[PDB]
C-alpha cells in the first residue's frame with residue numbers, strides 16, 4: 001500500500017517460519033534483523049551505522065515475505081536494536097518514495 | 100517526484116545558506132546532519148543507532164529546502180556518518196512509501 005511517515009513504517013514479515021515486525025528503511029542498503037533462529041550457512045561480516053559498528057552473520061538467498069510481497073536476498077543477523085528492511089529487499093517488492 | 104530504491108535516495112538540500120546532500124531515510128524518526136556550522140542556540144542530546152549513541156546538538160525551527168520543498172523542524176548536528184532526513188521532515192514535504 002501507500003504508507004505515510006507520521007508513524008514508524010513497520011510491516012509484518014515472515015522469515016524462516018517466524019513472524020516478526022520490521023522497519024521499512026530507505027536509509028539502509030541491506031536488511032539487518034535482530035538475533036533470530038536462521039537455518040543455513042553464513043559468513044561473518046560487520047556493518048556500521050550511527051554510533052559505530054556491529055558484527056553480523058551474513059546469510060544469502062534467504063526467503064522473506066514482507067507484507068505479502070515475497071523477496072529473496074541477503075539478510076544480516078546480529079545485535080541490531082530493530083529489524084530493518086533495507087533497499088536490497090525493498091527493490092524486490094517495488095517500494096518507492098513519493099513526495 | 101517518484102524515487103526508486105535501486106540506488107541510495109540522495110537529494111540536494113539547502114540549510115543555513117549551505118548546499119549539502121542528504122539521505123531520505125524512512126527509518127529515521129529524526130534529522131541528523133554531518134558536522135556543520137548552523138546559526139542559533141542549541142541543546143545537548145544523545146541519539147541511538149545501530150552502533151550505539153552519538154552526542155549531537157539539537158537545533159529547533161531550522162529551515163531546510165529539500166529538493167525545492169521547504170520545511171522547518173528540529174535538526175540534529177553531530178558525528179553521523181551521513182546526513183539523514185528523518186520522518187519529522189519527510190512528513191512535511193508530503194513524502195510517502197509506495198509498494
Ligand SMILES: CC(C)CN(C[C@@H](O)[C@H](Cc1cc(F)cc(F)c1)NC(=O)O[C@H]1CO[C@H]2OCC[C@H]21)S(=O)(=O)c1ccc([C@@H](C)O)cc1
Pocket residue numbers: 025026027028029030031032047048049050076080081082084086122124125126127128129130131146147148149150180181183185
Ligand atoms: C545511518 C544510516 C545511513 C544507516 N542506518 C539506517 C537508518 O535508517 C537507521 C535505522 C535504525 C533505526 C533504529 F530505530 C535503530 C537503529 F539502530 C537503526 N536510523 C537511525 O540511525 O536513525 C536515528 C535518527 O533517527 C532516530 O530514530 C531511529 C534511530 C535514530 S543503519 O540502520 O545504521 C544501517 C542499515 C544497514 C546497513 C547495512 C547492512 O547495509 C548499515 C547500517
